[PDB]
Amino acid sequence: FLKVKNWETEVVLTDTLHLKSTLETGCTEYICMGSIMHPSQHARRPEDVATKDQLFPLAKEFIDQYYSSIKRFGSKAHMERLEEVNKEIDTTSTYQLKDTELIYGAKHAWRNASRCVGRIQWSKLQVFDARDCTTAHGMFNYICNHVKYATNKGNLRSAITIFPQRTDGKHDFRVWNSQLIRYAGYKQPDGSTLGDPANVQFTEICIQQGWKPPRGRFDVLPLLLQANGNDPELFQIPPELVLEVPIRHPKFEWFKDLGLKWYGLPAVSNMLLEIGGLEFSACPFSGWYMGTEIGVRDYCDNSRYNILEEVAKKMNLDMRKTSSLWKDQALVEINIAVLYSFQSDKVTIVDHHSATESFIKHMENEYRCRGGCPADWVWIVPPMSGSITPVFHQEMLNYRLTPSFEYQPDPWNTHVWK
Template sequence: MAETAMPGAADTARPRCPVQARRTDGVAGVTELSAEARRFLLDDETPVDGDREQRLAAALAEIRATGGYRQTTAELAHGCRVAWRNHARCVGRLHWKALRVVDRRDAASAEEVFAACVDHLRLATNGGRLQPVVTVFGQRSPDGSGPRIWNPQLVRYAGYARPGGGVVGDPLHVELTAVAGSLGWRGTGGPFDVLPLIVQMPGEEPRWFPLPGDAVLEVELVHPDLPWFAELGLRWHAVPAISDMLLEIGGVEYPACPFNGWYVGYEIGARNLADTDRYDMLPRVAAGMGLDTGRDDTLWKDVALIEINRAVLHSFHRAGVHIVDHHTVTRQFVTHEEREKRRGRATPTDRDWIVPPLSASTTPVFHRTYTNAAVRPNYHRQPPAWR
């Protein structure tokens, strides 16, 4: 979902549709929430303890009294998994049933949210045998407030704007780096400085927390055939844990719900490291290979792009960290489509996100047609919290 981060989550800066806070303290808001609660709780898929109509009646009474309702742990877990299954931009949905759901709706302070995020990273990393995890914090109140994690992912690299132009580090995160600096954080100024986690609780100022080193697994990138590649000093973090999206289940909104799967190689090799507005490594790799970069028709960009992606896959495998290539993950996606079809369900798909940016026509998804639809439960983008 990445940048959806479930398996196949594109780790990019492509534009997304933001979701605004939905207030439920008015008649229209309560009516909409009640309708969504009814649809979710009466769905035969939803695990409900006891009589389904009685459960719905209790939820509707709670909505009338408080403007919201609290879902059971079983309802929450099911909603998280179905939200992944429904997310049109994730190519890795074959594994939706394996999502591990951590219910931390009890976290009442920024310290507790941060500690739970650190636990999330350790659980997801699993010694390199990555496992999909979502940690869900408190739901949004009727007035629209709720806990927020400001970082787009739990692990992100800082971007330092140079006074004379250019950026050291990740240009995608220059603004967030400046925000962290305004809160008192100071990085080393290096190209792969891990940003602190910024947490904001309702009614409080945002606070930053440094991630402990043992919670952030990183992979140093080397190439199987080009020894000089290691001298580039490239690395990337192992767990792509999206942390700024909103989870909506049965009308209830959870504005802080970090979730992860594992990387598809091209997310790192063809986007994060290769895009001209990110680390822009194609010219340096081409120079190291002695390629003719004077003309586009030498296809030097294509050759360099393939070698960066080879390095990423080789390095993750060498380090014992799970990653998947674009051929494998797209075959898995087709398997998921066929399974869903046999179960009488459609697979909403945003083709721009499912077809890989690398060797697209060699993958099975390139030759298929897709229909996108907004379905619920689902994960949605939110505007950056600092704006």
């Protein structure tokens, strides 16, 4: 038993789910790594094609969990499934998931994502099975359909598209983009950066692959898609599938003249989805934005669009010294405008007040039915106004449950070109 307390409400929750955790957190009895971005390299199967004694135990554990979930365990179909997975590994060194197991696995990987404040939605996830894909052209078709379904004319819907699992490690499917939709970044001759500085390296790869850059501040990047280990290929997402929101402010009429915009669909495409020892290296997933992601991090991080100085000037703030809080003051106005703009255009978005409140309710739900909820305080607390949200005052336990979403190397560090 482990208790967590909320210091605002004095609610105490009791955690037993942590007894099912599989991987190391990175912490020990003597050192806490809770603010390390990648604290652990502990993996459930070695790098390349596992032996039978390595894969089968992980498969059995997942199948046991799935059949437990549906009030079976030991049933006819469970034992036959075990035997089927046994023969499949014996004869191919891997196995294939049933459609139901795949959906269960994807939803539970989201459910287990301790860094995600959005998980009250976890069981309402649309799963697109793309395991029949064979070429980068087919990957583009599956991704276009995902983007169109998920955008839904602004009434955003959570979705995941799952490409063929890893086999030997030389035939990986990868989306090289970090998100399906991001803006290019360009190193300028004088030394500054145009567009998104985070994407300068990826933009250079695209240009080096023949992309013709319009060289603006908000150029939607092409897709760079890799199927079955082959060299990646460039595709332009049809712009009518890319919903964008011009940013304006409900009081500052000059705000629109800053020429800011963002895209509506946050779609992570560089993570790995691990189910029963199987590794799905291409599994783009998408939901909808919390405003602080755009307003605080994308726009105001020093190494991103870094717009605080420009907004503060227009606001006529005292920028001589930090103690005028001119940065904090512009920061609020920017986040007001982001929310106001998405809402004006009827594009789904949630503010950090509503999102964090939903997550406290999700925590309570999970402790009641599941006996726990893994949660990473460092990621869950929003990057502005921390303590006036309820999650700031909520103790959380962090542990690693499977199925899960994991980080993986960027493909340009590992891909041997042809």
